[PDB]
Symmetry: D2
Subunit: 263 residues, 4 copies
């Protein structure tokens, strides 16, 4: 089956940043034809730790910026919603509607996404056990979703730290396609006080583990200059490193694939 | 004075709210040293199953809560799940409750602070005690004056919550602290036998109030059946925590 | 039933330190007659994180020093063993043989302690669930122990941190008398790298919680000048604060006692 | 070369050790790029129940292990539980294994280092990856030269272990790293279905070897029956990890 790579800047800092990343993602999609690329970027960071942190330029601007990316590069789009009313307008551009991790149990939000007819990708809550995603998928199916994804992004492990329990990949695979979030799984929740931390040195090895265990895709936040990002500056992957990372997981996926268990 | 938030988890019917409201009114008259607040949700917006009980809607709920405030003169509190609900709910709710999973949703916190009402934020199971400082700041920024942080357990492995009582003194640095005695022993996706023991610990450690879900027949509750405290046991537990508090308060640490 | 207070300096830095603490503990035992005091001190810290940390002056010296405390003040004694052969010599002075937390599953050590006829106190491993102490007690009973204690000293919670799950007190009470370790439950395992850390500001509130829930005793490491201790300098309680702490828990115990559940 | 430590959990009988030893010898001849090491415990000194199988003693055990080293010429490794056992065990063991619960017992580590043999320390379920630096230092202080750190999971709530693969690159800074594929999925006080998936992750991430308990009929094993890998599946898993390693090694990070 076609491997999915969801990537893009964490936040829509501007329509310019988007076109810049989109240009590179378009180039890679032409090279890695066995991969289905989906451009990602949040029109709003509605759950920052600090009131003083960057949130975004609003739904309107964001959707417009995303529509430009899709229009200019012919790339599929995904973005997250935070309240029910946003599902309708977002669905006009987003091929995949993403549900934030803290909101994976909010029934109305899930239902709002499902009735759009668009694919839905739920970030697994840091508080959720892998077997408890079965009910999340059931809610979506009840709401009309026909294409559902569950994203692994780490689990609460003591304070300000997340651990990735790779047993979750084969467990969740029982009810939906599984995506591994390579960048948020290494972030340190509220690590820097007013903001969260992260250890970029573990992004690559954990992503190798993910494809070796077996998943249907990977999620990676990338930025031309991470150190200047308005969000996830500690975890966003340098855009120049994207191609190499993708080639690597495709290679590991291929060699490991024959051993993937039948779920 | 010491705060006691109690009531049925979900508004199964105004009828149910009135029965519980009667007992809470009685206790209110018996324990003048305690500020009672009646609680009940008009919607369980985060049930694990799509087939579980959610409620009768915001209007029916706000109505029933009004019946309790009018008939018994008890303060009110209920939780909201999306920004638009803040204004209508503030009509009856003295304290607006923020669900644990939503403790980081900026607009919900702002929408709550804007109503002018008091705001009680349930500490997310994923949150560290010191990370609540930023939650308080959001509310202050939004105009909130009466701010509460409620301890309801922290994720400890899968389908389990542990109460790190170190959180009480830490959170007290920036807000009043409430201990949720019923949800802290729940097993995500609980054991009633631990409710009382842990509530005794909370007051021995030191908090500004306790939160307890109570139902005439928990066994029949349409929500949190395994954790709701039987109505008839409420009085005894309150008397117990007041006595322990009276003695322990002498040692509560400053700031 | 008579409440137990196990206290003393973490390590036997010298026979002088022992007599100094013993003197104060003796004074308190005369005041708090409803309390059974047991003087504690390790002849060896056999599990320090660093090879460069203080261990002790040997079994011989330690036993001799402890015997002096018992002889001079008429106080019961307790100390921990690390290998089976130590149970016999230690039992000649120790009224209670303590089993280190990391060794709570070592069958021969438990058996060695039990056959001495002395009481045995097992520190619950940071890796052990409360219901799993049932088998630890079974091993001791099998080995002949007639007086058994289980000590709560925290559970692994993420890295370098311990949390106290007070649900453990009533659970363990089903099979043995329960002791709450007020000082080790707040230590930060390997927190300072070469050594562990600790937050003394939480010692008192957590001990209040312990007696409110209900236990059969408390364990507290105390030192004349904690900042100079050769071990647990971050967690050892100043000797001058001991009396006040004890009075406080006795008061909270009394008022909470009528509500203690029948196990 | 890549290390593969395998064998039956407990020395149920020299007979059993010989059957497993035969298959491991065969694989040894088939995979010359791999250094095989035969493992088995002469005593399960930390069983949860007093009524569980421990073993036939140190002498019977050391004898059987000698039979394997002599009859098949395979290197040997077994674990010790008290200092006095180091010397006698070193007579046959090429690698002395330190139990996870005992990874902080200084005298056991020193007693092991003193034998001159290689030492493999199982990382305690209570230990952080960076805390193993001090463990290595103790061994070096004791004269140890060949030092291994084995990842076997970390306490994650009650009766559960999680493998934080970030530990591999961290521990590699000061020692060779081995991934324990069978105990990492055990449920303290496990699921065989996760053994292979996680072992694939270990090699994709990068380690110096893997540890696997194998038994002709795990179902009948007197120890770790729920986690021991069936002997017949060993070859396939080894071939699989060699292939994944071959491809992934290109990306293993330096130091
Ligand atoms: O830096 P802070 O403000 O904590 O924000 C968290 C972000 O990392 C964000 O992308 C997170 O994954 C959202 O919940
Ligand atoms: O998982 P279920 O049983 O739906 O539980 C819902 C409860 O956790 C809920 O009532 C609680 O008050 C909110 O999280
Ligand atoms: O300071 P380190 O060396 O880590 O030693 C740990 C001590 O706190 C010790 O008393 C511990 O409780 C023993 O295991
Ligand atoms: O709890 P039981 O079943 O005795 O388990 C023992 C195993 O954990 C043991 O063989 C393992 O290798 C050591 O800890
Ligand atoms: Zn992001
Ligand atoms: Zn409830
Ligand atoms: Zn100590
Ligand atoms: Zn084993």
């Amino acid at each position: 089956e076609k491997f999915l790579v969801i990537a893009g800047p964490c936040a829509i800092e501007s329509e310019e940043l988007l076109l810049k990343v989109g240009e590179e993602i378009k180039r890679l999609s032409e090279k890695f034809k066995e991969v289905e690329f989906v451009f990602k970027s949040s029109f709003d960071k509605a759950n920052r730790s600090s009131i003083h942190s960057f949130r975004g330029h609003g739904l309107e601007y964001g959707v417009k910026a995303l529509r430009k990316v899709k229009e200019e590069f012919g790339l599929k789009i995904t973005t997250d919603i935070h309240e029910s009313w946003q599902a309708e307008p977002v669905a006009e551009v987003a091929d995949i509607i993403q549900i934030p991790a803290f909101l994976c149990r909010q029934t109305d939000l899930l239902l709002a996404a499902a009735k759009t007819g668009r694919a839905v990708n739920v970030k697994k809550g840091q508080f959720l056990a892998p077997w408890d995603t079965k009910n999340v998928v059931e809610k979506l199916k009840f709401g009309g979703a026909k294409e559902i994804y569950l994203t692994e992004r780490g689990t609460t492990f003591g304070y300000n730290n997340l651990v990735v329990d790779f047993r979750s990949l084969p467990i969740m695979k029982q009810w939906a396609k599984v995506i591994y979030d390579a960048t948020h799984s290494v972030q340190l929740p509220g690590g820097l006080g007013d903001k969260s931390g992260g250890m970029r040195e573990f992004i690559f090895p954990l992503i190798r583990a993910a494809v070796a265990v077996g998943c249907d895709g990977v999620f990676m936040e990338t930025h031309p200059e991470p150190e200047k990002a308005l969000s996830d500056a500690s975890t966003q992957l340098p855009l120049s490193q994207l191609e190499g990372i993708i080639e690597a997981i495709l290679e590991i996926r291929e060699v490991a694939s024959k051993y993937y268990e039948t779920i």
